[PDB]
Amino acid sequence: GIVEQCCTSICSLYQLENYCN
Amino acid sequence: GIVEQCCTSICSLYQLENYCN
Amino acid sequence: GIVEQCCTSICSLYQLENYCN
Amino acid sequence: FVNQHLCXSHLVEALYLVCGERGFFYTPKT
Amino acid sequence: FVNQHLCXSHLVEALYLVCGERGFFYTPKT
Amino acid sequence: FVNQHLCXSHLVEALYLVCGERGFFYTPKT
Ligand SMILES: [Cl-]
Ligand SMILES: [Zn+2]
């Protein structure tokens, strides 16, 4: 869950990059 | 109240359309 | 703190202008 | 369309999108 | 002008708008 | 990059920015 890893907790730039194509 | 029907509760597309001209 | 004067409390247009260059 | 709570700036943009050429009116009175 | 709480992205846009050509500075330090 | 909680519209814009030409996918399933 992206909403769970980034909207509930904090996503480092890296963690956020796991959702790019 | 739009702030009461859509910002406090959830507005279906229809309910939201009640605020178009 | 801008986050403290405007994101925690309410900033009148003036208070907000204290952060322009 | 979304099933979430739309507030302030996000509510205004939602109306903008949904209404197209009809335009719309925003008058908060909570 | 609004009488609400402006946070993050909404605070930055508010400054952008309010300041015009003066530009502005954003330095959160809560 | 920020160290804050990114939600909805702000999360989508963050992805847009971070991903560049790669594009991205948004599939909320909380
Ligand atoms: Cl928000
Ligand atoms: Zn927001």
Side-chain angles (χ1 to χ4, degrees):
Chain A
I2 182 175
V3 172
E4 213 47 60
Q5 298 276 279
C6 308
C7 171
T8 294
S9 309
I10 45 178
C11 284
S12 76
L13 182 44
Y14 179 76
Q15 312 199 65
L16 203 51
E17 300 215 65
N18 289 159
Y19 299 98
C20 295
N21 292 311
Chain B
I2 182 175
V3 172
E4 213 47 60
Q5 298 276 279
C6 308
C7 171
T8 294
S9 309
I10 45 178
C11 284
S12 76
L13 182 44
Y14 179 76
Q15 312 199 65
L16 203 51
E17 300 215 65
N18 289 159
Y19 299 98
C20 295
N21 292 311
Chain C
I2 182 175
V3 172
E4 213 47 60
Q5 298 276 279
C6 308
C7 171
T8 294
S9 309
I10 45 178
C11 284
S12 76
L13 182 44
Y14 179 76
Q15 312 199 65
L16 203 51
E17 300 215 65
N18 289 159
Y19 299 98
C20 295
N21 292 311
Chain D
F1 199 94
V2 296
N3 177 203
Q4 62 174 75
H5 301 340
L6 300 173
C7 296
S9 205
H10 307 290
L11 173 46
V12 175
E13 178 71 48
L15 287 185
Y16 179 68
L17 182 176
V18 172
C19 301
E21 315 69 65
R22 295 181 280 171
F24 64 86
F25 51 94
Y26 183 72
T27 63
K29 308 183 65 178
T30 307
Chain E
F1 199 94
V2 296
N3 177 203
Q4 62 174 75
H5 301 340
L6 300 173
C7 296
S9 205
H10 307 290
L11 173 46
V12 175
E13 178 71 48
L15 287 185
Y16 179 68
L17 182 176
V18 172
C19 301
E21 315 69 65
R22 295 181 280 171
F24 64 86
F25 51 94
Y26 183 72
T27 63
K29 308 183 65 178
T30 307
Chain F
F1 199 94
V2 296
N3 177 203
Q4 62 174 75
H5 301 340
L6 300 173
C7 296
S9 205
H10 307 290
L11 173 46
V12 175
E13 178 71 48
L15 287 185
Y16 179 68
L17 182 176
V18 172
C19 301
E21 315 69 65
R22 295 181 280 171
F24 64 86
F25 51 94
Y26 183 72
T27 63
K29 308 183 65 178
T30 307

